[PDB]
């Protein structure tokens, strides 16, 4: 059961407004959205990399990438 892949640009909000997330996203867990070729390339690590890593490093990475 995970979200839809987003490419990215589609939760990439880059104009605050308090705009509406896709059907099903996940604030603390956007990065469920970014598909591999995004994860890979948004954290520089294999969305498994993220599947493995922790809560912390995944939020210091998360926020790289602005899915936080």
Same mark, same amino acid.
């Given at each position: 059961?995970?979200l839809?892949?987003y490419?990215? &640009?589609?939760l990439?909000?880059? #104009? +605050?407004? @308090?705009? +509406?997330?896709?059907p099903?996203? %996940?604030?603390? @867990?956007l990065?469920?959205?970014? !598909?591999? &070729? %995004?994860?890979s390339r948004?954290?520089?690590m294999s969305? &498994? &990399? ?8 995944? #939020?210091?990475? +998360?926020?790289?990438? !602005?899915?936080?």
């Amino acid at each position: 059961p995970g979200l839809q892949i987003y490419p990215y &640009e589609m939760l990439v909000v880059t #104009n +605050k407004g @308090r705009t +509406k997330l896709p059907p099903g996203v %996940d604030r603390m @867990r956007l990065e469920r959205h970014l !598909s591999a &070729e %995004d994860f890979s390339r948004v954290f520089a690590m294999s969305p &498994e &990399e993220f599947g493995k890593l922790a809560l912390w490093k995944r #939020n210091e990475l +998360k926020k790289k990438a !602005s899915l936080f």
